[PDB]
Ligand binder design. Structure first.
Ligand code: AGS
Ligand code: AGS
Ligand code: AGS
Ligand code: AGS
Ligand code: MG
Ligand code: MG
Ligand code: MG
Ligand code: MG
Lengths: 257, 330, 167, 318, 493, 258
DNA sequence: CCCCCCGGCCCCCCCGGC
DNA sequence: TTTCGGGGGGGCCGGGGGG
């Protein structure tokens, strides 16, 4: 009960992080090292990749003797985490050659201790290397607005087209019942910078993606007020939500031209 | 439900203790010994209608648990849902949990288990096996072919015989004492004969006979009363019909049959059954006679079961008997 | 348009003779005394058993049961004390296990002062299963313990032409 | 009395592979597998009460030991075993991480697998294939034909034969010595004869006879165990004189309370299995028996119909 | 990290093929599939309209089918990996209902692979959708079988479907949409080297002469052969003729026969002799019926007149035995009606087996004189149902004018309607058109009713040739005139 | 409408009482006597017994001339009870030897009346006097906390183990995907006594119960903010929720320890 | 005031002997 | 093909609870 000891001062953060991508990937390998936690998971369709980084600063008393790998099913983890409380502190305990991990919910005001054990999964998924790439379009927009547009357009077509040109962003969805379009332009306000839609377009872009994948991606909006979308000519689109000391990234492969 | 006197006699005289079950002495003695020494196994009571299976199991439950046995046992019958889901949830929960009231073992009574589906019977196997340390099962049936071999493998079998003459006589005596009734020996013999080993028939017929008497406090139940209430032929009528068939010509036999039936409006099927009973005792020189009799009379009974022309059926009975008995000469 | 409703007597007067002269009481049943006497004694004994009427067509079984229910309860209480099911109704095993059982377990309808003063009003209701020989064997088996368990408030009457069809 | 004596079928249920009698070669194969591990997927089939569940449980226990509670998943007909269960619970168990000795695997015991639906069986295929490096599957059933061919392909077939009278006698003698039961040779012979190769039935009858009468002799055994009615039906059908067959029918079957439907069904089965009679005669007998069976199902179940059936059979045989 | 020792693995995994050449048997099918997947890109470039020498260029989906344990999944994965495609695999363990199919793999038919992009072949970024165990999905519409058939027509990426039974009704939607590739049971010769190598590696003695027997035990199931070797070698380290019979009998694969095989076996005279009946018992014959209780009686009734019997009793002609068999078949039909009634007397199924199949077969058992034919009763029943529906429609169109039932309409009215509707065209040409229409208007008959009426007649009054012989101008004018007027309606819906 | 007349100032109260145990038992015999109303029913599985008592003080008006038993189907009673509003008085009315029970919802302010009738049934179940027992351990805690613990542990397993030892209560649940264990210790707060967790142990206790039964039992948390639990090795576990003038009690049999 | 979880009908497909 | 009845599996609908 000493090899790995990672304490979140609030159990709500980890639960929210898991809920951010629990509807897209089932089995996930968490690699815990002295620098923090990193996870990479491929969806069943093999077109959506989820990457998660949690830094030590996000924790309270992070400690890792040697690198460890924990394979967990997100359904069981979510079921365990729903037994906690936001005020409660959540400590993850793992030992050498662990067949299970211990989740400890502690309450400071009271003397109530809740200890849970989660059986680890044997996962043999390969780890892919994502090298830094220079995209031709980068737009930062409010997460709520992006989710609203995605949900509105998903009601018409199974696919959504994103077109980026000079100070102009267009989301189109054409299906059988009808068609819908949404147009935005960059805007900044000193009084409310958090709503400032920012666009940097090195070159014009035009891509198409599946509605279900975007609906899964927008579930991370509860973690960050803003969302950053990076698009290249013929490369996967990157949807990033920033955390206190980590990130949640979704690499979505587009539909073939 | 104002009083027990308002119940039909078949229910008013339901045995309440093992001492009130007659005609099954071997089974009662064995099960009582099992209970006395705490060696009760899983039980299978197999037998024909109205022999005392349900009565015996209820009395055994009362003996084991007492007056409050109803809340201490799980009774399921053909009027209840007993699908595989019920086995998986209700029976399994009852078999795996302690008694609410006492610390004794648990009893599950699957009355009329021959009406249970094959899937439920198969699901019962591991429930019976796993929880045998604290739970026991009783299965009651009239038709053993509806029970899976696996279930029969796990149960100890007791066969309920058709009720013997002495048991029916004793129960009739008790009922007569209770009801303040008078019964003739000939009427009693006729009642036993028509009972066919089923106590329910005896009780129903006796209730009807009491209802028939003008003054049941003073009038005695004679065989005439029984034959009138049941609308059944007298032995003399059957003898006369058979004698006329076997001795007289066709005109006389037809006339005698019609007259005997019209006197009291007897049913042809009752006459056929009585004549078959009489003929079973007859010693026949030729097997062909018996073969013809059985085949033709079975065909006639099957035809009657679907209706048809009564007069033609009676003539067919006469002709079949005559043709069969013509084989006794050569 | 609309037509003024006819009186019961006038309606029955212009009915076919078989319906017009249907027996109205047990005394009008012609030649079934061996059973009608037993049934009549129940008006005083108040211990009616479960009944199985069987016989050939047009002998008076349905008329007999209707007249018995009339004599036992009265025109006011009959409907509340009788549940009739025949070959024109659905009588599957599910129906037997749910509807018949539910009616059998109910508390008997409360008689009025006039009903008590003018009719025997036995403390049980009656379920009539006319043309019972059309019911399947499994549905029949579903009735076995229902008949015995609720006999204190319910009595069954099965009517048939072919008694061999009854298990 | 509110106490129960533990049945001997449970008290003396074999706990090791060496205590199981019958099917010697398969038992030795299981012992060797348990020795060296590397247990493959297997399907064990056979008739009731011959030691299939016992064999599987003993193998699992001897293979796993202290890790039995964590490395065994048991499902039978009394548990939920739908396609959802296969896709979630069994899959999670197969994917689960468990440190085991160098030659051991997790075990899934699907008892009474013949009752499983075709959908669950289909879902089991790739689960068995993908996770075979850590999990192995043992099916136990009575009718292996119910197991779909793709599943049979992935498993090792073990067909259990019926127990001979010698093995049954050996086990009964062991239990008798352990219980100090007083018996006579005729009593044990009767118990074995009535058991018909079913060890569970034999032990249950022995215990019931001891409880109800103490001494295990012929008389007490036959009082507790009734002579199987199929033999009585065979004697009825093989009789030479119609009068003898009718007498057997009336006295040994009808007066004992056996239902007409049971009698006719048993007659059909016995006639089907009457290898001593020419097949064509058996077919005619079956035609007559089927006529009588249809009549009985119609509602006319009477002694007269059965007597007529016997008369027709005798007429055919003459 | 902990790895698994090769000694811990099943022999089937320890010796699974690693490349396409190690696959034993079915070389032609493997080459066909490989070439199809190799030229799929070119076929796409041509819009899947140009067929090559093999004719596989017009199929966007391949369908591999064969018996269990022959190398279907192995070959599919090997071909997918060899050409460098990214494999997206689905099986019976996954939910493939219509809803999941549309919400799942449907979006991957024209989508790039993130794995194929982060692992960089030019096809690496493209998918190969493998749907294994397609026969393991239940349902008619919600199952998604028709949905997969629809997917097979518009997929933008290669799609390979795998099943065991290609001829099941559920497979009907895949009639002519995929390139069908059949995998057959591999013979002993194609595998002998594999088993000998496994034997020498595993250190147990195996005699080659029994390999043919071993395969016969497994019915060509290589996976079952390997399992048998692994299980038997645990205690018996030498496999020879001294123990082959017992092993074969203990491990025999007992598969249910198909209707043609059931008919062939049941009508063989040998099994009805004393020795044959002692070897193949009456119980075995009843079980053979129960292999398919729905189709066996139909097969027997179809083929019981096409035999040369060898079981004829002295003085008995083939015709008399046929008559006895027909009588028994009629009795079996009565029993079948009893079974499927409201009483649901399924307990009568064994009796049916005797009356419908075993008894008549025993009466006419022998050698099949010609080919075994599939039952013609189902098609005739469907045709009769169609004709009765048409007759009912005609009757209720003409109900207002006629006085009869539908049977009377067919037997009596129809010939006169033929004389007053068809004959005039053959005598007056176009001049009769009006009259015919008049008659139709008098009976609320339509053009479709006219054709249906003409379709009923049999024997000498067949109309097909006569109708075809009518001049095309007369028929065109008839249609024009009927469409140029207003007509009444018998039934207002 | 004379023999039995009982008035509820708020129908919502009776609706909550019925909802507390309508998922446990289906068929209930309500015995009304001059001192109030009492019901006792055993579920179909015979594992759980529900016992309800309501005194006269719970009613604005109450008059029961003679004892009367009313057999009802709880689903039907709940259906009728959900008809009433939260601003209406609820009168239960029965006559001598009744065949039905009348429920009368009244709204004097709006002058609105709603009368419903429910046919009674012949239930041959005799009330079983639950003899008082000396329990090994007795504890009490807020209803919400116990309900949260039960709902959290029911996700993991179908069985929940309750163990009482010296100043400590442990709830454990071991399942296929993992295990859970919750520790609570006795504690008293003078600023919030309603949140106090109280324990009194004469002997240590260890019992196991079915999760579904506990999930059904916790539905009574809407009647009382606290719940009392009495446990003994040789007795069924007693879960009590206190009403203003009565109580609702659940007697749950533990699983066989084998 | 609006969204999500999860119990319950409802529909549709498939055996039915040993 | 298909005349009840049981069983299973998947789809919506809607109550309740939470935010
Ligand atoms: N051995 C018996 N002794 C006394 N009365 C009996 C006996 N057997 C039957 N009866 C009477 O008939 C009634 C019915 O008896 P049951 O025990 O229900 O018979 P049963 O064997 O259970 O009938 P089935 O199998 O459900 S048709 C009892 O209430 C008794 O009044
Ligand atoms: N015993 C009878 N006494 C007087 N009228 C009778 C009698 N039997 C039949 N009828 C007359 O025929 C009519 C029909 O009598 P029902 O009681 O319906 O006979 P049923 O036996 O019920 O006929 P089935 O069995 O349904 S064909 C009555 O309305 C009477 O008019
Ligand atoms: N070969 C055996 N040796 C010793 N006891 C046996 C043997 N077979 C059965 N028994 C005894 O009978 C009891 C039941 O054996 P089981 O293993 O349950 O038979 P089974 O074949 O699994 O029954 P089914 O197929 O589920 S009906 C065992 O606990 C033993 O006490
Ligand atoms: N042609 C083959 N050559 C060598 N081994 C084979 C061959 N076919 C099957 N096997 C062996 O059996 C194992 C399974 O082969 P599969 O490819 O799964 O056959 P399959 O036809 O897909 O069986 P199904 O349809 O899933 S029941 C392989 O790993 C091999 O060990
Ligand atoms: Mg009974
Ligand atoms: Mg009538
Ligand atoms: Mg077993
Ligand atoms: Mg495969």
């Amino acid at each position: 009960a000493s090899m790995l000891e990672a304490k979140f001062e609030e159990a709500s953060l980890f639960k929210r992080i898991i809920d951010g991508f629990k509807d897209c990937v089932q089995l996930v390998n968490f690699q815990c090292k002295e620098d923090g936690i990193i996870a990479q998971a491929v969806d069943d369709s093999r077109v959506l990749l989820v990457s998660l980084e949690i830094g030590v600063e996000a924790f309270q008393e992070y400690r890792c003797d040697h690198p460890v790998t924990l394979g967990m099913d997100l359904t069981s983890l979510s079921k365990i985490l729903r037994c906690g409380n936001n005020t409660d502190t959540l400590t993850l305990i793992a030992d050498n050659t662990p067949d299970s991990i211990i989740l400890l919910f502690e309450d400071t005001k009271k003397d109530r201790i809740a200890e849970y054990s989660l059986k680890l999964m044997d996962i043999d998924a390969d780890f892919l290397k994502i090298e830094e790439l220079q995209y031709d379009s980068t737009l930062s927009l409010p997460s709520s607005e992006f989710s609203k547009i995605v949900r509105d357009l998903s009601q018409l077509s199974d696919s959504i087209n994103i077109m980026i040109t000079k100070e102009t962003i267009k989301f189109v969805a054409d299906g059988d019942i009808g068609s819908g379009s949404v147009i935005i332009k960059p805007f900044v306000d000193m009084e409310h910078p958090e709503t400032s839609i920012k666009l940097e377009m090195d070159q014009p872009v035009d891509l198409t993606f599946g509605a279900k994948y975007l609906l899964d991606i927008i579930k991370g909006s509860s973690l960050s007020d803003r969302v950053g979308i990076r698009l290249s000519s013929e490369a996967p689109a990157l949807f990033q939500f920033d955390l206190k000391s980590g990130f949640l990234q979704f690499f979505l492969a587009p539909k073939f031209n | 439900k104002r009083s027990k006197e308002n119940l039909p006699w078949v229910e008013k005289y339901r045995p309440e203790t093992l001492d009130e079950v007659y005609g099954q002495n071997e089974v009662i003695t064995t099960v009582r010994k099992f209970v006395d020494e705490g060696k009760l196994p899983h039980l299978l009571f197999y037998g024909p209608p109205g022999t005392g299976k349900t009565s015996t199991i209820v009395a055994l439950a009362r003996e084991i648990y007492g007056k409050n046995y109803s809340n201490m046992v799980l009774e399921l019958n053909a009027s209840d849902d007993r699908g595989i889901d019920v086995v998986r949830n209700q029976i399994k929960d009852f078999a795996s949990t302690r008694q609410i009231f006492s610390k004794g073992f648990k009893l599950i009574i699957l009355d009329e288990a021959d009406a249970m589906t094959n899937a439920a019977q198969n699901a019962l196997r591991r429930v019976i096996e796993r929880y045998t340390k604290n739970t026991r099962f009783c299965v009651l049936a009239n038709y053993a072919h509806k029970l899976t071999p696996a279930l029969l493998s796990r149960c100890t079998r007791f066969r309920f015989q058709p009720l013997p003459q002495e048991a029916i006589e004793r129960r009739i005596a008790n009922v007569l004492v209770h009801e303040k009734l008078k019964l003739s020996p000939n009427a009693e013999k006729a009642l036993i004969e028509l009972s066919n080993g089923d106590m329910r028939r005896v009780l129903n017929v006796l209730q009807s006979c009491k209802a028939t008497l003008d003054n049941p406090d003073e009038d005695e139940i004679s065989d005439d009363v029984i034959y009138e209430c049941c609308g059944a032929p007298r032995p003399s009528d059957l003898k006369a019909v058979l004698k006329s068939i076997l001795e007289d010509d066709w005109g006389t036999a037809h006339y005698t049959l019609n007259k005997v039936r019209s006197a009291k409006g007897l049913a042809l099927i009752d006459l056929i059954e009585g004549i078959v009973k009489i003929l079973e005792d007859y010693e026949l020189q030729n097997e062909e006679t018996r073969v013809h009799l059985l085949t033709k009379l079975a065909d006639i009974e099957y035809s009657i079961s679907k209706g048809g022309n009564d007069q033609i059926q009676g003539s067919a009975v006469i002709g079949a008997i005559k043709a069969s008995f013509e084989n006794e000469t050569v | 348009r609309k037509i003024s409703k006819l009186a019961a007597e006038q309606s029955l007067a212009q009915q076919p003779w078989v319906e017009k002269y249907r027996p109205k009481n047990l005394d009008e049943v012609t030649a079934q005394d061996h059973a009608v006497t037993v049934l009549k004694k129940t008006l005083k004994s108040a211990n009616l058993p479960h009944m199985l009427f069987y016989g050939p067509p047009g002998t008076g079984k349905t008329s007999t049961i209707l007249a018995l229910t009339k004599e036992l309860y009265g025109p006011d209480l009959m409907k509340s004390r009788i549940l009739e099911l025949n070959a024109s109704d659905e009588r599957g095993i599910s129906i037997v296990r749910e509807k018949v059982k539910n009616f059998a377990r109910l508390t008997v309808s409360k008689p009025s002062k006039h009903d008590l003063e003018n009719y025997p009003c036995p403390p049980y209701k009656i379920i009539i299963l006319d043309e019972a020989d059309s019911m399947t064997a499994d549905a029949q088996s579903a009735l076995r313990r229902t008949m015995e368990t609720y006999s204190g408030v319910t009595r069954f009457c099965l009517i048939c032409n072919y008694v061999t069809r009854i298990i | 009395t509110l106490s129960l004596q533990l049945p001997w079928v449970e008290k003396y249920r074999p706990q090791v592979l060496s205590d199981i009698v019958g099917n010697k070669e398969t038992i030795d194969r299981l012992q060797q597998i348990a020795k060296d591990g590397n247990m493959p997927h297997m399907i064990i089939s056979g008739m009731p009460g011959i030691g299939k569940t016992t064999s599987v449980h003993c193998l699992a226990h001897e293979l796993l030991g202290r890790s039995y509670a964590d490395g065994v998943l048991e499902l039978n007909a009394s548990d939920d075993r739908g396609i959802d269960v296969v896709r979630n619970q069994i899959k999670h168990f197969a994917q689960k991480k468990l440190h085991l000795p160098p030659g051991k695997h997790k075990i899934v015991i699907l008892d009474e697998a013949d009752s499983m639906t075709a959908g669950a069986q289909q879902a089991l295929r790739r689960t068995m294939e993908l996770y075979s490096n850590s999990t192995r599957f043992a099916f136990a059933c009575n009718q292996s034909n119910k197991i779909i061919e793709p599943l049979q392909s992935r498993c090792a077939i073990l067909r259990y034969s019926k127990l001979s009278d010698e093995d049954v006698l050996k086990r009964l003698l062991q239990i008798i010595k352990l219980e100090d039961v007083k018996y006579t040779n005729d009593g044990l012979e009767a118990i074995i004869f009535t058991a018909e190769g079913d060890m569970r039935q034999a032990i249950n009858n022995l215990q019931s006879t001891v409880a109800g009468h103490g001494l295990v002799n012929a008389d007490n055994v036959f009082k507790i165990v009734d002579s199987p009615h199929p033999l009585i039906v065979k004697k009825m059908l093989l009789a030479s004189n119609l009068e003898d067959s009718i007498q057997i029918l009336r006295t040994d079957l009808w007066k004992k309370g056996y239902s007409s439907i049971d009698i006719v069904t048993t007659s059909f089965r016995v006639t089907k299995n009457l290898a001593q009679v020419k097949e064509s005669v058996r077919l005619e007998m079956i035609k007559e028996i089927g006529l009588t069976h249809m009549r009985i199902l119609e509602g006319v179940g009477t002694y007269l119909q059965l007597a007529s059936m016997l008369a027709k059979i005798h007429k055919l045989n003459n | 990290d902990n790895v698994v020792r090769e000694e811990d693995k099943l022999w089937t995994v320890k010796y699974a093929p690693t490349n396409l050449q190690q696959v034993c048997g079915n070389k032609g099918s493997v080459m066909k599939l490989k070439n199809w997947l190799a030229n799929w890109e070119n076929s796409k470039k041509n819009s899947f309209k140009h067929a090559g020498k093999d004719g596989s260029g017009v199929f966007r989906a391949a369908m591999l089918y064969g018996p269990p344990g022959i190398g279907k999944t192995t070959a599919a994965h090997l071909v997918a990996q060899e050409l460098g495609y990214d494999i997206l695999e689905q099986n019976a363990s996954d939910v493939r209902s219509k809803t999941l199919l549309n919400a799942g793999v449907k979006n991957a038919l024209d989508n790039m692979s993130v794995v194929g992009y982060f692992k960089h072949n030019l096809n690496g970024k493209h998918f190969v959708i493998i749907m294994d165990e397609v026969d393991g999905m239940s349902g008619g519409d919600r199952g998604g079988v028709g949905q997969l058939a629809q997917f097979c027509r518009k997929t933008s990426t290669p799609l390979i479907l795998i099943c065991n039974e290609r001829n099941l009704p559920k497979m009907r939607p895949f009639d002519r949409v995929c390139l069908d590739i059949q995998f057959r049971r591999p013979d002993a010769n194609s595998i002998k080297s594999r088993l000998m190598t496994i034997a020498i590696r595993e250190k147990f003695k195996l005699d080659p002469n029994v390999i043919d027997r071993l395969i016969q035990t497994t019915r060509g199931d290589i996976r079952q052969v390997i399992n048998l070797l692994s299980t038997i070698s645990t205690t018996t380290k030498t496999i020879n003729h001294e123990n082959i019979n017992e092993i074969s009998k203990a491990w025999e694969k007992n598969i249910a026969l198909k209707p043609f095989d059931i008919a062939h076996k049941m009508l063989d005279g040998q099994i009805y002799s004393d020795i044959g009946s002692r070897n193949f018992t009456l119980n075995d014959k009843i079980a053979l019926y129960f292999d398919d209780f729905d189709f066996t009686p139909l097969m027997i009734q179809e083929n019981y007149l096409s035999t040369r019997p060898s079981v004829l009793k002295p003085g008995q002609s083939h015709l008399e035995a046929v008559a006895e068999a027909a009588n028994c078949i009629s009795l079996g039909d009565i029993v079948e009606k009893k079974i499927r009634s409201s009483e649901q007397l399924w307990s009568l199924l064994p009796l049916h087996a005797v009356l419908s199949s075993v008894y008549p077969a025993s009466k006419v058992a022998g050698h099949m004189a010609g080919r075994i034919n599939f039952t013609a009763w189902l098609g005739q029943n469907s045709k009769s149902a169609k004709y009765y529906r048409l007759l009912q429609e005609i009757h209720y169109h003409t109900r207002l004018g006629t006085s009869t039932d539908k049977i009377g309409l067919r037997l009596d009215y129809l010939p006169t309607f033929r004389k007053r509707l068809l004959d005039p065209f053959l005598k007056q040409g176009a001049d009769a058109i009006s009259s015919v229409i008049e008659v139709m208007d008098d009976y609320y008959l339509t053009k479709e009713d006219w054709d249906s009426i003409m379709e009923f007649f049999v024997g000498p009054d067949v109309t097909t040739a006569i109708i075809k012989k009518i001049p095309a101008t007369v028929k065109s004018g008839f249609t024009r005139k009927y469409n140029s007027m207003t007509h009444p309606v018998a039934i207002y819906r």
